[PDB]
Short mmCIF file of C-alpha atoms and ligand atoms in Angstrom, two decimals:
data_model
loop_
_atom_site.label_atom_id
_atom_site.label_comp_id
_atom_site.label_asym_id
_atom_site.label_seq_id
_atom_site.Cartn_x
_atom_site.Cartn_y
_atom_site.Cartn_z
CA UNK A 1 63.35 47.61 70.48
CA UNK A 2 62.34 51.01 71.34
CA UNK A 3 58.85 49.44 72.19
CA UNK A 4 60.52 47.74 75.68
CA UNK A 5 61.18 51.24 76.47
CA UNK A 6 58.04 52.88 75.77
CA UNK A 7 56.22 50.12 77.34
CA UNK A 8 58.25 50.57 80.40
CA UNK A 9 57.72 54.37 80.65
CA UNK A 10 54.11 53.56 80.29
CA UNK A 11 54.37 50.78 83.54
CA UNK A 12 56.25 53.95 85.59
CA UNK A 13 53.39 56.27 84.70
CA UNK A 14 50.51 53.66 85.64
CA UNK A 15 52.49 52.72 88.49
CA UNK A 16 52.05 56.20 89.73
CA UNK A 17 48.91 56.44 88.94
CA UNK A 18 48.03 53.33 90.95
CA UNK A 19 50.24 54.90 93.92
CA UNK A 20 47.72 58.37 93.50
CA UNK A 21 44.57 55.87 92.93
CA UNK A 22 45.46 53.74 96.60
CA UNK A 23 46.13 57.10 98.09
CA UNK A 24 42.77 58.33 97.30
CA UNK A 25 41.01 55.19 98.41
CA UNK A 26 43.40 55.67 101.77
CA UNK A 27 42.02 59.05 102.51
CA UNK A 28 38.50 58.68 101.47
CA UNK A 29 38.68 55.60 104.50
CA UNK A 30 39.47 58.67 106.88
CA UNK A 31 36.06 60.83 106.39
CA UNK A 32 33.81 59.15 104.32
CA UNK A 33 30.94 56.04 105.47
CA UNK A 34 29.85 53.79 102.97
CA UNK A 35 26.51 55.65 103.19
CA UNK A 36 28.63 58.88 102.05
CA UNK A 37 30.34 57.28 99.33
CA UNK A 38 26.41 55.94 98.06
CA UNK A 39 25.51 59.55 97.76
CA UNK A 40 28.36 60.76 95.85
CA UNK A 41 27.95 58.10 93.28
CA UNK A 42 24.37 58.90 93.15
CA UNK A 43 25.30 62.81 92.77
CA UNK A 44 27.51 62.13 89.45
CA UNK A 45 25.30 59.71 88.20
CA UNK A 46 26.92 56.64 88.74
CA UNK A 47 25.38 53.39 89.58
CA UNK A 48 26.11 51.89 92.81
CA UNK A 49 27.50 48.29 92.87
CA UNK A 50 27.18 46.01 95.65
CA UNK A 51 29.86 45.46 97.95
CA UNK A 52 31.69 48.27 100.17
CA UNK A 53 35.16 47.43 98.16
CA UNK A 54 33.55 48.28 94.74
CA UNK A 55 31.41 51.38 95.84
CA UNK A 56 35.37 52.73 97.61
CA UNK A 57 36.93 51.71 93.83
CA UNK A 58 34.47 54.05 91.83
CA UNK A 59 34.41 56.96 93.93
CA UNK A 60 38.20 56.80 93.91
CA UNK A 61 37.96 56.50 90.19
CA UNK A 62 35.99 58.82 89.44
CA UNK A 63 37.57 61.55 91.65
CA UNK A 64 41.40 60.63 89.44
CA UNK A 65 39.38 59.83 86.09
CA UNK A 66 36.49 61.52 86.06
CA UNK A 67 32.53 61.05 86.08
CA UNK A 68 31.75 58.05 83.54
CA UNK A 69 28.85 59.48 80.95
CA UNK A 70 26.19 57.00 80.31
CA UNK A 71 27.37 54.35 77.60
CA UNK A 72 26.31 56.53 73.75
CA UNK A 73 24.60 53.48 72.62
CA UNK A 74 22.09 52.24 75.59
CA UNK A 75 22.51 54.64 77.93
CA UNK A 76 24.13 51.60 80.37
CA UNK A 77 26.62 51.58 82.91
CA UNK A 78 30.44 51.40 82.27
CA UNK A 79 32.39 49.62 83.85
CA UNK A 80 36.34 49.11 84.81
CA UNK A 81 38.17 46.02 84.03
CA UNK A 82 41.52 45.06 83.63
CA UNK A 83 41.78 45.45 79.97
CA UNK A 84 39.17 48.53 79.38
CA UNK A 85 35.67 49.89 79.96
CA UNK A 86 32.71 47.90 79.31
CA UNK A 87 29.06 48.98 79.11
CA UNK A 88 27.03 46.42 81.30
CA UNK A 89 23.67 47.78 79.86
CA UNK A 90 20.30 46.01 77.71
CA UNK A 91 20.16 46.99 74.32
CA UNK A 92 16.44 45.34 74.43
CA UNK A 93 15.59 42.42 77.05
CA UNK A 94 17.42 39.87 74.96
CA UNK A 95 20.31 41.50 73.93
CA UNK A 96 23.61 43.22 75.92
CA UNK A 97 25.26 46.00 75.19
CA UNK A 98 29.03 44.98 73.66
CA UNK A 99 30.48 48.38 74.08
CA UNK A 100 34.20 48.59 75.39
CA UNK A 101 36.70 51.01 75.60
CA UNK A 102 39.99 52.28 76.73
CA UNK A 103 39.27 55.62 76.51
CA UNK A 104 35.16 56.15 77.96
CA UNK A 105 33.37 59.37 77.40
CA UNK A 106 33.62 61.54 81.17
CA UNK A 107 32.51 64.86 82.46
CA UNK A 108 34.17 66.08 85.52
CA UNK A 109 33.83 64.56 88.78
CA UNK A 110 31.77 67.10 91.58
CA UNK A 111 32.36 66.76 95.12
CA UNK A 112 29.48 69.04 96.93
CA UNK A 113 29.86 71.26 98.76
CA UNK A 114 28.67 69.36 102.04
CA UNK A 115 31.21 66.75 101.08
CA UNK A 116 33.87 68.82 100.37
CA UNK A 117 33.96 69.94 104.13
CA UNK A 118 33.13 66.49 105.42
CA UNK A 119 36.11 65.90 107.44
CA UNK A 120 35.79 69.41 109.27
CA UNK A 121 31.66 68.15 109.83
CA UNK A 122 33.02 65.25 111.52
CA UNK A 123 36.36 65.75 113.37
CA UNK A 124 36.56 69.41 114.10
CA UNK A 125 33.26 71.22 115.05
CA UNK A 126 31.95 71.07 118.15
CA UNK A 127 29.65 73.02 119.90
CA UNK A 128 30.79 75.76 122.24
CA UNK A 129 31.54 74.91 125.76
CA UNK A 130 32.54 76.80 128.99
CA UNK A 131 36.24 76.78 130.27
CA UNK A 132 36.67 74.41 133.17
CA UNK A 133 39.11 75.16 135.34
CA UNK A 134 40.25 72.64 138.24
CA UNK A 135 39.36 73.10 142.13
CA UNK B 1 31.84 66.35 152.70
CA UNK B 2 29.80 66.79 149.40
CA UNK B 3 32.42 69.46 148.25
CA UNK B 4 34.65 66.15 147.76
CA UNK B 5 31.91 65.08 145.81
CA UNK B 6 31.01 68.22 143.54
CA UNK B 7 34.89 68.29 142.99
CA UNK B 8 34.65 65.19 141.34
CA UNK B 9 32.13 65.85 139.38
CA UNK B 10 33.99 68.49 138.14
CA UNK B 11 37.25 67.13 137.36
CA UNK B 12 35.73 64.27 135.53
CA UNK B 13 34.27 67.15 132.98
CA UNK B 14 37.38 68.66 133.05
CA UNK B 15 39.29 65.46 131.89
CA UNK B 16 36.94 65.26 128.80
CA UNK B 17 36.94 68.63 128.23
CA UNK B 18 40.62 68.42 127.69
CA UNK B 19 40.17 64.73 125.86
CA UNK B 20 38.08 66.75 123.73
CA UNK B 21 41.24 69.38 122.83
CA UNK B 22 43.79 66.89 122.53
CA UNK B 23 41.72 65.26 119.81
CA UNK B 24 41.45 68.78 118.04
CA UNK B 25 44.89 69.36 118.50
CA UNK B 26 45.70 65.83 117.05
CA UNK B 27 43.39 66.30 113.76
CA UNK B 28 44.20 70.16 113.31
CA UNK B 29 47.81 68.88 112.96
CA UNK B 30 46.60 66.72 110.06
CA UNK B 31 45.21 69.58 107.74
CA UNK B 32 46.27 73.01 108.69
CA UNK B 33 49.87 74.03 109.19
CA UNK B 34 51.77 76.82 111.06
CA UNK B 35 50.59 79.18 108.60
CA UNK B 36 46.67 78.22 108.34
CA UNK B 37 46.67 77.90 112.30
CA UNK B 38 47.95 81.87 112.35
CA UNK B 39 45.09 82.50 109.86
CA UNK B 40 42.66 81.33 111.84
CA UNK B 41 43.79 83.22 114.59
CA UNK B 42 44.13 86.59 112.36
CA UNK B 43 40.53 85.90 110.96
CA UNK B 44 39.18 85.55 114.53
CA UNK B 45 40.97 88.41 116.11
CA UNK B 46 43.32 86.83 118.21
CA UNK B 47 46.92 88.22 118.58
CA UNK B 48 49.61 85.39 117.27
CA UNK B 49 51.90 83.84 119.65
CA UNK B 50 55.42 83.07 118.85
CA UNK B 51 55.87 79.56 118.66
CA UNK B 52 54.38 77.10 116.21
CA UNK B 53 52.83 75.23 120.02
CA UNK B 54 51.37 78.12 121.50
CA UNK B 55 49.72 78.73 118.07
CA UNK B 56 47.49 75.34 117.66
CA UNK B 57 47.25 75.90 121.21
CA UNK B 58 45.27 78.89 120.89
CA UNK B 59 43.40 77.85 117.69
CA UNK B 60 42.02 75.11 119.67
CA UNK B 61 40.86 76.65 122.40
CA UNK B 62 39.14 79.09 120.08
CA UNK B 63 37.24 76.07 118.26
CA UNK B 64 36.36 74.58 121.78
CA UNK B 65 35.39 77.75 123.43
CA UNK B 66 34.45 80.71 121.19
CA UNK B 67 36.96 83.49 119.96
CA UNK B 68 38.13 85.90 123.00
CA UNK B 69 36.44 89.32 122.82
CA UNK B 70 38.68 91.89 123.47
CA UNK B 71 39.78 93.28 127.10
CA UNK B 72 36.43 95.57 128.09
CA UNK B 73 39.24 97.83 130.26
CA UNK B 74 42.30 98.04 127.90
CA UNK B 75 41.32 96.01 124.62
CA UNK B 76 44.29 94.08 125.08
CA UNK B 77 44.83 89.76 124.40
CA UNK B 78 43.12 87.96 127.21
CA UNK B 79 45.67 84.76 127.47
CA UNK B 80 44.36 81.48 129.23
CA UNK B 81 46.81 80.53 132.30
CA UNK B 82 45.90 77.55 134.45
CA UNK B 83 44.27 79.31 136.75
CA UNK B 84 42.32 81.99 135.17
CA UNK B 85 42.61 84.31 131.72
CA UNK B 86 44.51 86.77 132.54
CA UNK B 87 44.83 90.16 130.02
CA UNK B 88 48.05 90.87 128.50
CA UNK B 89 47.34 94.85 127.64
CA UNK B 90 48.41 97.94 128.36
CA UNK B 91 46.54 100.31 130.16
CA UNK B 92 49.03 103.35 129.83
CA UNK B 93 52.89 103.15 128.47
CA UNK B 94 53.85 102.66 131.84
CA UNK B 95 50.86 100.56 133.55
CA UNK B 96 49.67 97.21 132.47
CA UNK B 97 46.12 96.09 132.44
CA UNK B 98 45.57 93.27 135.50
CA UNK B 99 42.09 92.10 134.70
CA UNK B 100 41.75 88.53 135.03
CA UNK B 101 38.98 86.12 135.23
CA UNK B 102 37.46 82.22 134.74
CA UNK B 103 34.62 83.28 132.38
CA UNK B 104 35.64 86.06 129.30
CA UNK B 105 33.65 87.48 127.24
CA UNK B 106 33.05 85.63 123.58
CA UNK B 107 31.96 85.46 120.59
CA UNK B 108 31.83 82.34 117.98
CA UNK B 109 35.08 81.15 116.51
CA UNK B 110 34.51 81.08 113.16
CA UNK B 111 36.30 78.76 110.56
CA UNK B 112 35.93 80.29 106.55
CA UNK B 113 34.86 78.10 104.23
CA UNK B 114 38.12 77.74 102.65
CA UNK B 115 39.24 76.16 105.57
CA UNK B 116 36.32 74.04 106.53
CA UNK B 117 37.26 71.98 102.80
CA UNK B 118 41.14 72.46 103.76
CA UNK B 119 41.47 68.50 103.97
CA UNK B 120 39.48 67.03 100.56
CA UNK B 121 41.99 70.43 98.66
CA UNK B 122 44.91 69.25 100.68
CA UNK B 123 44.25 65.17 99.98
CA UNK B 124 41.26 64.84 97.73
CA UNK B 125 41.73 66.80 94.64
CA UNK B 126 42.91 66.32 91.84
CA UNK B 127 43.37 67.51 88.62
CA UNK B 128 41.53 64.88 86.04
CA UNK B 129 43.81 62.45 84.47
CA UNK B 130 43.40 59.83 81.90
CA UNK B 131 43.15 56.17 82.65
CA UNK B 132 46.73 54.04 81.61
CA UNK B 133 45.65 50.21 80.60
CA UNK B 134 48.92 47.73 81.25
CA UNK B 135 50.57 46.55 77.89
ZN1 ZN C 1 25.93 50.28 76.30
ZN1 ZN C 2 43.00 94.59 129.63
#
């Protein structure tokens, strides 16, 4: 009964939080390389996947949700997907890590300092010229 | 003959030295508004125009060209006309200051830090949030 309801609050608040999510991957486009969003991954100690799409999706993650900590149990890296986070790390060479959650372990996400100012870096300083002024 | 020549020359840096504003122009108007572009000003010692035009105007000159130093005769605002800067002081209460010339004094234009990261506050952060899985 009431659980229609509460499951459609819940669709208006991840709807949102899609809308932020898409937003973030929008503006990151503006100012950041693929090379730039490597570094930043390597910074909070995130793997890097293959694939331009999927190293845009955890930067953008990670600056809404936070840095992912290394899985508790094998020290592997979690992963999004639809339903929750899953570790994709070795317990030993024959056996995968299981782990999967909704709610993953995080610390906060740091953008550098150099990153932080990124856009001014790249669309805004120039060197000093002289005033032209026509004949 | 070769005057047509140098002429050329120098209109040809003149078009991409204003190319070069128009673009600053263009991306200041993404991240600062009215109010950070009479900041910048204030921070670099420049007098503040009225009108919210004549205000990116003169912040992007500054970040193409170095700040203005004061007038060396009156301390008055040198202003850039098309032809020249011209000084806007006061050399008495009743006798204004007429220096003018293509090549004022200047120092760097400096941007704060606070401003250089003015896009990834404006766009970029965000306060952490947890992850919402569908139903
Ligand atoms: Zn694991
Ligand atoms: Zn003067």
């Amino acid at each position: 009964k009431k659980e229609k309801d509460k499951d459609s609050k819940l669709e208006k608040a991840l709807k949102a939080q899609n809308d932020l999510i898409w937003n973030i991957k929008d503006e990151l486009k503006k100012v950041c390389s693929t090379n730039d969003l490597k570094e930043l991954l390597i910074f909070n100690k995130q793997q890097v996947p293959s694939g331009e799409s999927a190293i845009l999706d955890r930067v953008a993650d990670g600056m809404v949700f936070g840095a992912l900590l290394p899985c508790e149990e094998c020290s592997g890296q979690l992963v999004f997907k639809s339903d929750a986070y899953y570790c994709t790390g070795d317990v030993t060479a024959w056996t995968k890590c299981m782990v999967k959650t909704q709610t993953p372990n995080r610390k906060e996400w740091v953008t550098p300092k150099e990153f932080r100012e990124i856009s001014y870096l790249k669309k805004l300083k120039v060197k000093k010229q002289d005033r032209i002024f026509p004949p």
